[PDB]
């Protein structure tokens, strides 16, 4: 119960990219 495409194991990668924290400042 743990393959590669996991996405209980993907949600930590697709949380990493936090580009919505960083482009608070590009407006």
Do not use: Q, R
């Amino acid at each position: 119960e743990k393959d590669l495409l996991a996405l209980d194991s993907w949600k930590n990668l697709w949380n990493w990219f936090n580009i919505t924290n960083w482009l608070w400042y590009i407006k």
